[PDB]
């Protein structure tokens, strides 16, 4: 009613946080086609490598 | 003392219960109307007795009220007034030079209350900050211009305190 | 300037508004300057200066007469 | 490549440490030495140890040395064991056998260390604790002047 | 692979804009708390004030205080800027919206926080003013003494998760947020972050871009600690615990909302309470938070082990 | 496994570049002993937290033996901290 | 001059807009005019609302409000503080005492005006000046700043 004028810069901060979060979700996806996977272990790394080799082969 | 009292005052020490009581007050004041004013648009309240910029008044016939009695110059505690007088062509007692040092003026209103003819008054104007020092050395022409520019408000105020002065 | 009453118009085009207060006051006597070029911060004539600063209750149109 | 430069900078920083006029510059190059050593450890896959080197060496010891130098005076001053493999990796890179049995459940350097640091070798852990307690006790007795 | 600088720019520039608007938000919220209004003339609601401030500090024709080595003095703000921004490469905003997914993220954050002591120290000595040197020394000691408690609280959180991956700590709170059981731990963490940043009752304290970089680094640290507070205890990007019909809201919005709530708590706390004294800062931080953090670590580990509720 | 540090290194390089750009923006146109005691205590407790780091993650494999080993470690450092306390090294 | 008369004008307008929108004065409180300055920055008049925020040190302030009686013993410190501010700096004299000595003009230990020690840009009259009078003085200083043409004059020489 009167307190919303102090929520404008505070909401701008939230918009900045959202844009930082969403920039990497549409830039990393742009050159990979897949969202980043959390929890990369050596099994996952080797298995993505095998994916790359098999895709290159056929 | 009591175990109950020890427990009660140890909890308040650890749970910060006397700081939540201050946070609540500040938050309650957060959602409240503000009391700030838009200075360029709305001005703060004043009084008809307000002592602001000086002005030299004149009679409705167009004759200046100042009779060069120098009674305001002798009461001025700051010695901010200098008056030179002589006999005019008509033989009337009038001032040739009437200048006020606004850098010496203390805005006490002694000159206004000492004038026997209500010639010198302090108008309601308080917004006259200048960019140069000698623009604050008001002379007779400047004071008369102030009186002509603020004549209606000065007259209304002097009418208001006719019941008090 | 919303839910407000226009008291009068000045020779310079300035518009004077008023709102009714109950117990705490606020935004009840202000001016909408007719200019926007920095507005010079001092453009209120003597007849409207007293009304704006609550010195007198006369609007300024009544102060002329 | 990355190893060569990250070792060269560390050697230069150490040389400046042992040959520094102003001790503050010596402390700064001392910090740079461990900054490079952390990257060198990172190249080995010991992510935990590099982070601890950052935390311990240039987080506690370097800060302590800086405190001492600043506020006090700032005064003036091969073929036998492991024969190297020659660069023949055009065919060696193809001859890399990967066993997926060891990758199905892979431990991090942290949990691999913590699996045996606290159960199978706990006495050494407590001896290090006693060393820390000795340091705590000896810091006070040497340097303490109340009121 | 040339798009990594695009990601770094997209995470760095909005961070600076958010820092400027956080300064504006602080100056507005304090004005609203004290029955006035913040900067309002410059913008529609003061939103243009930070840009005017930036152009002012840029266009000042300032002089460099070359009465020193001129290298350490000029690089100390640069170093603290390094450390303040580098910690944002691991903080996740949603499921897969993290720049660098480390498996040692908690320890990397601890290292970055512990390495922030050098900038203020170098700035303190490089300035020939002895009194500024002593003030920087005191601030460094305070940051150290509360970083200890921050690390212990990190241990308390890490026990219940079992992994140092930040993006997995959030996923571990799918059942309930860690702020509900460990509420005293959350309060202690918030207070320690207040003392770590030289802020709130814990805030005891040259020109142009050096001071600008120090100011920006301090406010970026404030934002980062609010993010950590919502990341370890408030569930990160996870939605509200109950009523799962609003799931159309992206997870990145919830993280932002909780961060804004914690920033409001920073501004609120600094506005509502007076300052502590140095002889009380150290006593408090070494006698009220270290024992409590250690006791909470012991209690959580003992309770989880007893009932075999470990990860 | 360690491929996730290259983004951090490039981030450091670009942060350096933007900091240098910011610096170039305006260019175009006695002794107290308690400060040593606090550092000593910080070093000791930083090592303690370092030792907590492996214990917290691997608390599921070790069980009722690693927990009590950590408890003995904590007891020794707590005796040391109590000695620090009563000796007045924590006061100012 | 096909675009210099335009581009230089716009960049100079941007410079003036920044300088008017963000003024950081250094309040030099000396006497009862300090009370009026504190009242101006309080909730009623809200000097912050225009972007003005006070600063403690002269390193970070581009304006300097001398408000109080300047004595002979204090003038060297006044000048030293003035000499420490960066180049685009302005001085505002507030009250009769700072303007011309005021009510202690004929004293043996009073400097008859702060303009004998530092160059003054705006004189605010009063004893003490009203808080709205100080608002008017700051607005006049803003109006004077908008008159500056730094980039055009630099181009013309
Ligand atoms: C204590 O006194 C002080 C203040 O008053 C409180 C300040 O506000 C401040 C600083 C205030 C500021 C607004 C400076 C901050 C300026 C910046 C962070 C510049 C950022 C600019 C950019 C990131 C470029 C713009 C990028 C985009 C538009 C891309 C959008 C995504 C300082 C330094 C100070 O000392
Ligand atoms: C959803 C979001 C919710 C909010 C999240 C944020 C929460 C914080 C919000 C703001 C709270 C107020 C912040 C004020 C900041 C400054 C406060 C510092 C004051 C302080 O440190 O108090 C000390 C003691 O109290 C203390 O020790 C304080 C720490 C106590 C932690 C709680 C420990 C309780 C343990 C109970 C366990 C029971 C459950 C488990 C079985 C000193 O006080 P003193 O002067 O008396 O000196 C003690 C000598 N003896
Ligand atoms: S108001 Fe007082 S100080 Fe000013 S001219 Fe009148 S008598 Fe003199
Ligand atoms: S202004 Fe009044 S008091 Fe002063 S000389 Fe004229 S008539 Fe006399
Ligand atoms: S001008 Fe008046 S109010 Fe201001 S310092 Fe001088 S005597 Fe005091």
Curated annotation (Swiss-Prot), chain B:
Cofactor(s), by name: [4Fe-4S] cluster
Catalyses: a ubiquinone + NADH + 5 H(+)(in) = a ubiquinol + NAD(+) + 4 H(+)(out)
Chief localisation class: mitochondrion
Query: What remark does the entry make about the cofactor?
Result: Binds 2 [4Fe-4S] clusters per subunit.
Residues the entry annotates as binding [4Fe-4S] cluster 1: 66, 69, 72, 115
Outline the extent of the 4Fe-4S ferredoxin-type domain: 57-86, 96-125
Q: Which family does it belong to?
A: Belongs to the complex I 23 kDa subunit family.
Q: What does this protein do?
A: Core subunit of the mitochondrial membrane respiratory chain NADH dehydrogenase (Complex I) that is believed to belong to the minimal assembly required for catalysis. Complex I functions in the transfer of electrons from NADH to the respiratory chain. The immediate electron acceptor for the enzyme is believed to be ubiquinone. May donate electrons to ubiquinone.
Protein name stated in the entry: NADH dehydrogenase [ubiquinone] iron-sulfur protein 8-A, mitochondrial
Could you tell me which species this protein originates from?
Answer: Arabidopsis thaliana (Mouse-ear cress)
Swiss-Prot record, chain C:
Please identify the protein, giving its name as recorded: Probable NADH dehydrogenase [ubiquinone] 1 alpha subcomplex subunit 12
Q: Which residues of the full protein are shown?
A: 46 to 110 of 159
Q: Show the taxonomic lineage.
A: Eukaryota, Viridiplantae, Streptophyta, Embryophyta, Tracheophyta
Q: What disulfide bonds does the UniProt entry report for this chain?
A: none
Assembly and binders: Complex I is composed of at least 49 different subunits.
Task: Provide the protein's localization.
Answer: Mitochondrion inner membrane
Q: Which family does it belong to?
A: Belongs to the complex I NDUFA12 subunit family.
Question: What function does the entry list?
Answer: Accessory subunit of the mitochondrial membrane respiratory chain NADH dehydrogenase (Complex I), that is believed not to be involved in catalysis. Complex I functions in the transfer of electrons from NADH to the respiratory chain. The immediate electron acceptor for the enzyme is believed to be ubiquinone.
Curated annotation (Swiss-Prot), chain D:
How the protein sits in the membrane? Multi-pass membrane protein
Family recorded in the similarity comment: Belongs to the complex I subunit 6 family.
Q: Name the encoding gene, please.
A: ND6
- Describe which stretch of the whole protein the shown chain covers, with first residue, last residue and complete length: 1 to 174 of 205
* EC numbers for this chain: 7.1.1.2
Its recorded reaction(s) are: a ubiquinone + NADH + 5 H(+)(in) = a ubiquinol + NAD(+) + 4 H(+)(out)
> What protein name is recorded for this chain?
NADH-ubiquinone oxidoreductase chain 6
Membrane-crossing ranges are: 48-68, 123-143
State the organism's lineage. Answer: Eukaryota, Viridiplantae, Streptophyta, Embryophyta, Tracheophyta
Record the organism. Arabidopsis thaliana
Quaternary assembly:
Complex I is composed of at least 49 different subunits.
List the GO molecular function terms: NADH dehydrogenase (ubiquinone) activity
Query: Where in the cell?
Result: Mitochondrion membrane
What further note is attached to this protein's record? A stretch of 270 kb of the mitochondrial genome is duplicated within the centromere of chromosome 2 resulting in the duplication of the gene. The expression of the duplicated gene (At2g07731) is not demonstrated. It is also probably not RNA edited and therefore differs in all the positions known to be edited.
* Main subcellular location of this protein, as a coarse class: mitochondrion
Which EC class is this protein assigned? Answer: translocase
GO cellular component terms listed in the entry, alphabetical order: mitochondrial membrane
Q: List keywords of the entry alphabetically.
A: Electron transport, Membrane, Mitochondrion, NAD, Respiratory chain, Translocase, Transmembrane, Transmembrane helix, Transport, Ubiquinone
Source species, domain of life: Eukaryota
What biological function has been recorded for the protein in this entry?
A: Core subunit of the mitochondrial membrane respiratory chain NADH dehydrogenase (Complex I) that is believed to belong to the minimal assembly required for catalysis. Complex I functions in the transfer of electrons from NADH to the respiratory chain. The immediate electron acceptor for the enzyme is believed to be ubiquinone.
Curated annotation (Swiss-Prot), chain G:
E.C. number, please?
7.1.1.2
Q: What is its main location?
A: mitochondrion
Q: What keywords does the record list, in alphabetical order?
A: 4Fe-4S, Electron transport, Iron, Iron-sulfur, Metal-binding, Mitochondrion, NAD, Oxidoreductase, Respiratory chain, Transit peptide, Translocase, Transport, Ubiquinone
Per its UniProt record, the required cofactor names are: [4Fe-4S] cluster
The cofactor note from the UniProt entry for this protein is: Binds 1 [4Fe-4S] cluster.
> Where, by residue number, does [4Fe-4S] cluster bind?
32-33, 97, 127
- State the top-level EC class: translocase
What is the catalytic activity of this protein?
a ubiquinone + NADH + 5 H(+)(in) = a ubiquinol + NAD(+) + 4 H(+)(out)
Compartments (UniProt record): Mitochondrion
MF term (GO), any: zinc ion binding
State the GO CC annotations.
mitochondrion; plasma membrane
How does the annotation summarize its subunit structure?
Answer: Complex I is composed of at least 49 different subunits. This is a component of the iron-sulfur (IP) fragment of the enzyme.
Q: Report the function annotation for this chain.
A: Core subunit of the mitochondrial membrane respiratory chain NADH dehydrogenase (Complex I) that is believed to belong to the minimal assembly required for catalysis. Complex I functions in the transfer of electrons from NADH to the respiratory chain. The immediate electron acceptor for the enzyme is believed to be ubiquinone.
Protein family according to the UniProt entry:
Belongs to the complex I 20 kDa subunit family.
What's the protein here called? Answer: NADH dehydrogenase [ubiquinone] iron-sulfur protein 7, mitochondrial
State the species of origin: Arabidopsis thaliana
Q: Which residues of the full protein are shown?
A: 62 to 218 of 218
């Amino acid at each position: 009613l009167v307190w919303l004028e102090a929520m404008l810069p505070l909401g701008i901060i939230g918009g900045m946080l959202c844009i930082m979060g969403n920039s990497q979700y549409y830039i990393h996806k742009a050159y990979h086609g897949r969202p980043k996977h959390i929890g990369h272990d050596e099994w996952d790394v080797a298995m993505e490598r095998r994916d790359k080799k098999v895709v290159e082969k056929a | 003392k009591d175990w109950n009292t020890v427990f009660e005052r140890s909890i308040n020490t650890l749970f910060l219960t006397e700081m939540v009581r201050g946070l609540s007050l500040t938050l309650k004041y957060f959602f409240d109307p503000k009391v700030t004013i838009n200075y360029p648009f709305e001005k703060g309240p004043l009084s008809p007795r307000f002592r602001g910029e000086h002005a030299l008044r004149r009679y409705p016939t167009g004759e200046e009220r100042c009779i060069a009695c120098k009674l305001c110059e002798a009461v001025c505690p700051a010695q901010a007034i200098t008056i030179e007088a002589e006999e005019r062509e008509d033989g009337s007692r009038r001032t040739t030079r009437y200048d006020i040092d606004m850098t010496k003026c203390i805005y006490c209103g002694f000159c206004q209350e000492a004038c026997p003819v209500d010639a010198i008054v302090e108008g309601p104007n308080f917004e006259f900050a200048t960019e140069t020092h000698e623009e604050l050395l008001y002379d007779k022409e400047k004071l008369l211009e102030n009186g002509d520019r603020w004549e209606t408000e000065i007259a209304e105020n002097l009418r208001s305190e006719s019941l008090y002065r | 300037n919303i839910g407000a009453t226009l008291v009068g118009v000045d020779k310079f085009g300035n518009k004077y508004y008023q709102k009714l207060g109950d117990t705490q006051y606020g935004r009840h006597r202000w001016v909408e300057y007719a200019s926007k070029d920095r507005y010079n911060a001092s453009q209120v004539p003597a007849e409207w200066h007293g009304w704006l600063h609550f010195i007198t209750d006369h609007t300024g149109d009544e102060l002329l007469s | 490549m990355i190893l060569s430069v990250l070792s060269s900078l560390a050697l230069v920083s150490g040389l400046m440490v042992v040959r520094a006029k102003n001790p503050v510059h010596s402390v700064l190059f001392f910090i740079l030495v461990f900054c490079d050593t952390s990257g060198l450890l990172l190249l080995l896959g010991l992510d935990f140890f590099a982070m601890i080197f950052l935390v311990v060496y240039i987080g506690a010891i370097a800060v302590l040395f800086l405190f001492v130098v600043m506020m006090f005076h700032i005064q003036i001053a091969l073929d036998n064991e492991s024969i190297p493999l020659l660069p023949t990796q055009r065919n060696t890179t193809s001859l890399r056998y990967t066993v997926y049995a060891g990758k199905v459940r892979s431990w991090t350097n942290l949990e691999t260390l913590g699996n045996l640091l606290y159960t199978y070798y706990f006495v050494w852990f407590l001896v290090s604790s006693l060393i820390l307690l000795v340091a705590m006790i000896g810091a006070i007795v040497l340097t303490m002047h109340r009121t | 692979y040339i798009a990594v600088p695009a990601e770094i720019l997209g995470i760095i520039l909005p961070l600076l804009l958010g820092v400027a608007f956080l300064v504006l938000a602080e100056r507005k919220v304090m004005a609203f708390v004290q029955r006035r209004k913040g900067p309002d003339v410059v913008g529609s609601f003061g939103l243009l004030q930070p840009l005017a401030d930036g152009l002012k500090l840029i266009l000042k024709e300032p002089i460099s205080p070359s009465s020193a080595n001129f290298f350490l003095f000029r690089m100390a703000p640069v170093a603290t800027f390094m450390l303040s921004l580098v910690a944002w490469a691991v903080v996740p905003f949603d499921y897969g919206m993290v720049l660098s997914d480390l498996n040692i993220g908690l320890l990397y954050l601890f290292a970055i926080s512990s390495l922030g002591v050098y900038g203020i120290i170098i700035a303190g000595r490089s300035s020939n003013s002895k009194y500024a040197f002593l003030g920087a020394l005191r601030s460094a000691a305070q940051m150290v003494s509360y970083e200890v408690s921050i690390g212990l609280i990190l241990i308390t959180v890490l026990i219940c998760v079992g992994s140092c991956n930040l993006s997995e700590i959030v996923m571990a709170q799918k059942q309930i947020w860690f702020g509900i059981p460990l509420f005293p731990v959350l309060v202690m963490f918030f207070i320690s972050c207040l003392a770590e940043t030289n802020r709130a009752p814990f805030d005891l304290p040259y020109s142009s871009m050096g001071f600008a970089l120090f100011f920006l680094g301090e406010y970026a640290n404030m934002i980062l600690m609010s993010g950590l507070c919502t990341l370890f205890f408030l569930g990160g990007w996870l939605p509200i615990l109950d009523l799962p019909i609003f799931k159309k809201i992206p997870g990145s919005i919830w993280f932002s909302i909780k961060v804004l709530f914690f920033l409001f708590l920073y501004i609120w706390v600094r506005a509502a309470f007076p300052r502590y004294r140095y002889d009380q800062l150290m006593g408090l931080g070494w006698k009220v938070f270290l024992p409590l953090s250690l006791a909470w670590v012991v209690s959580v580990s003992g309770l989880l082990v007893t009932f075999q509720w470990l990860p | 496994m360690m491929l996730e540090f290259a983004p951090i290194f490039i981030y450091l390089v670009i942060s350096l570049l933007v900091s240098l750009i910011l610096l170039g923006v305006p260019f175009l146109f006695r002794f107290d002993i308690r400060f040593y005691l606090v550092s000593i205590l910080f070093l000791i407790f930083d090592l303690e937290v370092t030792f907590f780091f492996p214990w917290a993650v691997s608390l599921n494999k070790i069980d009722l033996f690693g927990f009590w080993s950590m408890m003995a470690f904590l007891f020794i450092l707590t005796i040391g901290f109590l000695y620090e306390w009563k000796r007045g090294a924590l006061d100012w | 001059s096909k675009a210099a008369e335009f581009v230089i004008s716009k960049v100079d307008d941007l410079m003036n807009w920044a300088r008017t929108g963000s003024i950081w004065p250094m309040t030099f409180g000396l006497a009862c005019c300090a009370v009026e300055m504190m009242h101006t920055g309080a909730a009623r008049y809200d000097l912050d609302r225009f972007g003005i925020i006070f600063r403690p040190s002269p390193r970070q302030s581009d304006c300097m409000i001398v408000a109080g009686t300047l004595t002979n013993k204090m003038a060297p410190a006044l000048r030293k503080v003035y000499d420490q501010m960066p180049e685009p700096r302005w001085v505002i004299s507030m009250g009769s005492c700072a303007n011309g000595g005021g009510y202690y003009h004929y004293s043996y230990s009073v400097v008859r005006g702060c303009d004998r020690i530092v160059p003054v840009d705006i004189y605010v009259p009063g004893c003490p000046p009203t808080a709205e009078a100080l608002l008017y003085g700051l607005l006049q200083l803003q109006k004077k700043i908008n008159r500056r043409k730094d980039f055009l004059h630099w181009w013309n020489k």
